[PDB]
Point group: D2
Chain length 485, copies 4
């Protein structure tokens, strides 16, 4: 199949220019004005529209069982929703229980995903415990299973938390094999104590998740893991950055030349924790995730500015929807509300509205935070994240003059609540092209399950590791030459 996108503006993360785009056999063939193409192409009129790289969502949890609930979206519905939302690649999470095999958990995820995915994907692997067998499995995964990123938690005590000596060893191992170390940095002991205290004070409602983990617990842990990472010489990637305090730690570390990257979520970047205090339990529960949304009304604006600024690099949905009925496992004990919100479909439009229409960043920075930075990180750039000849034809024809209002009743992503309910959005995907085929057009989705493919991710991505080679020569530490005492 052969596709001509005609009359639009191509928007990459570096600049915008008027140009048509010609696609064939999964691949962008030409970009320019007045192209010489074979006749019989499908012509897509993009006048007045922007032609952007499809979104890449670096955090998704399709099919995941978590806190005794199974995410409502499997790999087919989740990728569909992504595509209807202008995202053309997802990275899913693998989360083995403590003491279980990382490789088995990865293979099980591959088995669920390969036959269902509608778009390209790859996987992060969780490191929820530490032992010789874990290190050997890390290695196997990077060496031959196309993994280059692991996820660790500083919180979820007794479930997924690693202690400081374990993190030290884990980061050392990630660095040796050229992997990215993703970390969720809240202080797990202080979280556990805070939750227990709040319950003992009679706070059982969803607001407990905000009260029990104030932002200093995030800032502290973020500061600690940056320091551990800097001592092991491992690039560190903070996830779900939620607060001004943690943003400030990250900015100060970056000023000091430390190798720190950071990601936030659509929700953290746009919504306040005031939702946890809503009179309706279900509404309040529906915003429950960690670290929690914050009360400080400056939080959104500041996180959005950090994104515009490249203090935060990447924005993800962290999609993990649950229904109100599932959330209600914690109707009487907030610590049992499963953590997850929906957003894989909302991400592009929401960030467009608050980021670009809101004047925090321009359309090019929007591409950077929604695809290009991720692609570099994953070692997939410019194959993904850029409209140029030779790249994968993962392309969105984006309408910056659209009329969409977001609602749960029209969404295709799972969950019974949409967090952005009633938000007017000026940017929507008009057409989505994935692997050089139109999968969404005129409001209709059409794609067979299993069309998408796993994309092995090569180790040592340049955008982080290239400078670390030279930096490692720079840390030349020698003693003083004395004669012996």
């Amino acid at each position: 199949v052969r596709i001509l996108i005609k009359g639009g503006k191509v928007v990459n993360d570096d600049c915008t220019h008027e140009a048509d785009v010609y696609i064939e056999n999964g691949i962008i063939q030409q970009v320019g004005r007045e192209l010489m193409i074979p006749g019989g192409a499908k012509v897509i009129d993009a006048t007045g529209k922007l032609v952007i790289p499809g979104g890449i969502d670096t955090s998704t949890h399709f099919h995941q069982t978590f806190m005794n609930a199974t995410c409502v979206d499997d790999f087919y519905h989740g990728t569909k929703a992504a595509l209807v939302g202008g995202t053309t690649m997802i990275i899913g999470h693998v989360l083995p229980d403590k003491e279980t095999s990382l490789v088995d958990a990865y293979e099980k995820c591959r088995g669920l995903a390969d036959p269902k995915v509608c778009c390209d994907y790859a996987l992060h692997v969780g490191i929820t415990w530490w032992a010789p067998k874990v290190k050997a499995e890390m290695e196997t995964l990077v060496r031959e299973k196309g993994v280059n990123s692991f996820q660790m938690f500083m919180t979820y005590k007794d479930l997924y938390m690693l202690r400081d000596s374990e993190l030290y060893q884990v980061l050392h191992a990630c660095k040796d094999i050229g992997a990215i170390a993703r970390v969720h940095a809240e202080n797990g002991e202080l979280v556990a104590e805070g939750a227990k205290e709040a319950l003992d004070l009679g706070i059982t409602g969803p607001e407990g998740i905000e009260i029990s983990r104030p932002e200093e617990l995030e800032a502290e842990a973020t500061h600690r893991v940056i320091t551990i990472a800097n001592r092991t010489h491992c690039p560190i990637y903070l996830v779900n950055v939620s607060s001004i305090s943690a943003g400030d730690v990250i900015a100060a570390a970056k000023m000091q030349g430390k190798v720190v990257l950071a990601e936030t979520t659509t929700a953290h970047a746009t919504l306040t924790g005031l939702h946890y205090y809503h009179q309706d339990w279900s509404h309040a529960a529906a915003y429950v995730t960690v670290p929690p949304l914050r009360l400080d009304t400056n939080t959104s604006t500041y996180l959005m500015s950090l994104l515009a600024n490249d203090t935060l690099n990447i924005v993800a949905s962290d999609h993990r929807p649950f229904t109100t009925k599932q959330k209600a496992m914690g109707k009487e004990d907030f610590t049992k509300i499963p953590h997850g919100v929906s957003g894989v479909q909302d991400r592009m439009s929401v960030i467009w509205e608050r980021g670009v229409v809101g004047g925090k960043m321009d359309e090019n920075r929007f591409v950077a935070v929604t695809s290009s930075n991720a692609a570099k990180l994953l070692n997939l750039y410019p194959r993904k994240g850029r409209i140029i000849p030779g790249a994968d034809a993962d392309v969105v024809v984006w309408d910056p003059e659209a009329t969409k209002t977001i609602s749960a009743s029209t969404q295709v992503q799972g969950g019974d609540f949409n967090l952005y309910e009633n938000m007017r959005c000026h940017g929507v995907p008009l057409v989505t092209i994935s692997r050089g085929r139109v999968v969404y057009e005129n409001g209709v989705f059409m794609c067979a399950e299993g069309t998408g493919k796993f994309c092995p991710l090569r180790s040592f991505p340049d955008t982080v590791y290239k400078k670390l080679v030279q930096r490692e020569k720079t840390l030349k530490v020698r003693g003083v030459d004395r004669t012996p005492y």
Copy 2:
């Protein structure tokens, strides 16, 4: 003339890839592997080399008379030196005296430059006073003379300094016409008083320039002009950022979402003010420029990290050499030492060594700070600052395994001192191509004077102004609707 650069790695600010480059009629025609080209091309072997966009030096002062001395390099020698150093465009300064015509000063500069330049160039225009006639000349300059950037000074009292109400009006006017406001931000009253105090205390030597203007005078002024700029909604561009204090003001402003860009110089980024305390007068005088090099030994590393980080965006030479004999105008009164150091030839190699070999940034960020960011700012990107089909063939074949040691005796730039004397440099230009011709190769320079061209710079560069359109809708200020008292 037709040129094939074969076997090299193309290094743009986004990534590096193996590819040959084919040039014809001033313009890059193709970039790829195994190109289909007409025979009889000049083939340049770039195996083991990097093929980068030629440098763009955003601050040069060829032919300028300043503080009663005339810069040693005219537009021919200065552009030659730039080219031998891997820089293929320069932006020169126009500096009309108070109460004189901006347009006449610009036309005089054009007259000196057009017949002499070896590479492409454009010009900044200084705004050294304020009146209706100045505003009208700003307009004429942007509307029809290809100017999009003005330079202002917060210091040089009685010579070039603008007062606060004048800066306010100047920034307002720059914004209305889509220009970039460059500002040298030191507190001119406090500078004047400090210089007078130091002289009265018997400090006559070059170290006076460091003692008389400590870094708080920079930080204060930087803070003030950012605030004025934010109130007028004008993008502000700080120049010659020299200190940790001023860097911190700039970072904090950027965290707050203010529209601030910033430039530093090779020297500020790499050298310490310890030089001003050298026993030999000439050595000490040779480092005299403003704001002065700082004593704090962390200063270089921190400014280099800011550059890697994009807290500082761009690095310039600020080339203005004078001889020891000219400097000696101030042998008995440091306030009469003319401000200027040489560096148009040194910039690429020096930053390569301290930036890339030193492990602060990778080769791609190096391109960003030496050409691409400048090009975006100037409204010349991707025509300049990028190796891609259609761009201007301003190209350097850069050897990252070179053996050069810097010395005044081998330099082609003017001045009798080289500031980097004896520095070993691992990166040097092997070949320099300007407007699709080889101008430097096998250590030989060859280019006729006047080969280079003036490049009109269009107003409202997107990389700054695109977001300001949306941001300006965002500042919707309305009263409270009351019934009347």
Copy 3:
């Protein structure tokens, strides 16, 4: 002589609290201890369950002042009565000469209004609203012969009271030479003028204009500027009306660097939000109008209170300048004409007690520091005032920390028709107020003849600032490098 025994209470100084009785005779505290031997026939005041504290010293009052064409409704009699009923036993008033008029004349007129009327001790600050050699000579006369050690300057009120940078420099130089304290209201006046004019042009005429037209960056900028000037002239600088987080942070950073910076805030800035300016009722909104304005950031109060507890801010004042609604209505159609002033001389001790002490931000001793002792040191009156010890002036309040007062305009004795704290339930009430060793308020009755209070000359070079500077002056020779002929 009148002889007074305060029995059974706890003495609270700024350093510690102890159980002790207090015996007063002839204007002076004679004894403090647990079991006193006193002449019979004393008036016995039962202070069981009460605290015996030094009377408040309010460092900023504007009795009888005409300002922005309105005359403050409290003259020196009613204003000092109100102070006393509120637990304040000394006031410092402002002298404000029109630009180009005599500082001495304006001081002598204020003395004429105050000396015959004051109920409690007082002194005066003198405004320096312009500069010329003649102003310098008057500063010298005032410190040398008129018991002045403190001058007030403005960086805002352009064309009325604003001083430019070169003038502040000279002014601070002169204050320092004669051992005076330089109080400065630091907002950027040019930007305030332009902001006000721009807000009016945008149709904002309501009181909220005062917030919109001078956002906090105008304060932070100016605070930063004057600290820098002061540091260059070696003059202690004292910031007044600190209103914002930004300006507070500048002050804290300066103090970290060893700069000699002190700072004051007001009751209102420390306790109230600018949301009041957006009230539907015009009068309510106008009533809160003062400068710098109350801020919208909801964290502002808490942060400023914490700064006070922490000694980033040293002193809390009322800045009492009440106007009626009828006078505020001068600006009913143009917010720039609403005269700046709120009431609070009576409210200060109770309000800060409630928000500061009961609110858990500071303890009772720090309360005494920030309401009397720090002021006393600064004024060169410590331990004569601000401390309960033998030999001090008997300005003493018997304070009830348990009892509440609900504040209301209908019950206040201070002037104005609005109380800013209307309906606030305040713990901490003065039960008895003693001034110059007489009971002037007791059992809710006020009893004091006009003109009982005295002017208190304030000696130059107060140790708490100057002792360190004088030593720095001997300390520091920066010297040039020694080079030979």
Copy 4:
């Protein structure tokens, strides 16, 4: 009784200085004033031109301690003698039980070594080097019956004294419940262990290893962590041995936020640089070894001194633990075996006088605050100690601010064969030292029987920290949202 009149001097307390004589009888200051009526036959001390200050209180000493397999060379007799000769009249010693051994036993052994030997008053801190319910019960016994109100914890010395996060949490909870002060040495112990091991593997065996292996981020991280823990448990936290700009900034930021944080540093950290570790002579370099180490950043001293002046740091201690060169040489081939300790109990008053007061960082009153008064408040001994007033203990130094002493190992009475301040010319000498109302040092002669000093029980809940917290405890109900069944 012995009766002493100190005549003609200036009394310097932490709040102010005044001219006054001082009369002492029976261990106690009886009178302070200008012209005293005293019984004849007093010993008259002529203090004309001198300052009469409260004797120093050294909050960190390690007399008779065995540590890292070396026994401190000063026992309680020589250590208190040295303190006295140096103007310090009370010491607080450390108790350090091995992990899993009884806090009470270790306290009782220290009491047995001290009670028969001390020349001046003293008390003890108790180390909490492990946690279990049994440790909690011992903390309670100690505060309730053994005159302890202060415990010392370590975040470093892994496997020896380090406490993990869950243990610190529990420990701080317990300290708070019984009204004790939690002193903490905050470096990240895991990272210190790994750093030391990595430095040795890199061939660094010299003393500079102590600097290289624990850079300041390890301190800043841990300081940040324990402040956060403390804030969550509502326990006042007291940081010890603050050594770096990074850790100082964490402390200042925490204090800005109203967190209850106090902090101490040492003479050496406040005055010396880590350049000493790079000295060519092994012994010289080893002699400076302590933790956290002296830092290389040349601004460190000045900044820490400024923090002290500024009350970001409250108290300065010696941390006296001298070893000989012969004992240091345990680590001649492995820097991790050099025992941590430097001498300084005798040097503290003079060194801080010279660098703090003569150096212009603080005045004489603040000097008294940071050498005696703040410590006294913290210990719950103020104004009994730390203040010259009637009724206080007669621990008094007649201090000569003009006279100099050149410090040298050859003339010192404190132990060790190196003085860290060798050859420093110090203004400020104790001329006379009075302890418990007897002259123990005068005319360079020391005269005091061993066991003259007494243990001083330290009462729980010192007001200066706890009065604010106790009120916060009543203050704060965070409550859940009210939703109906």
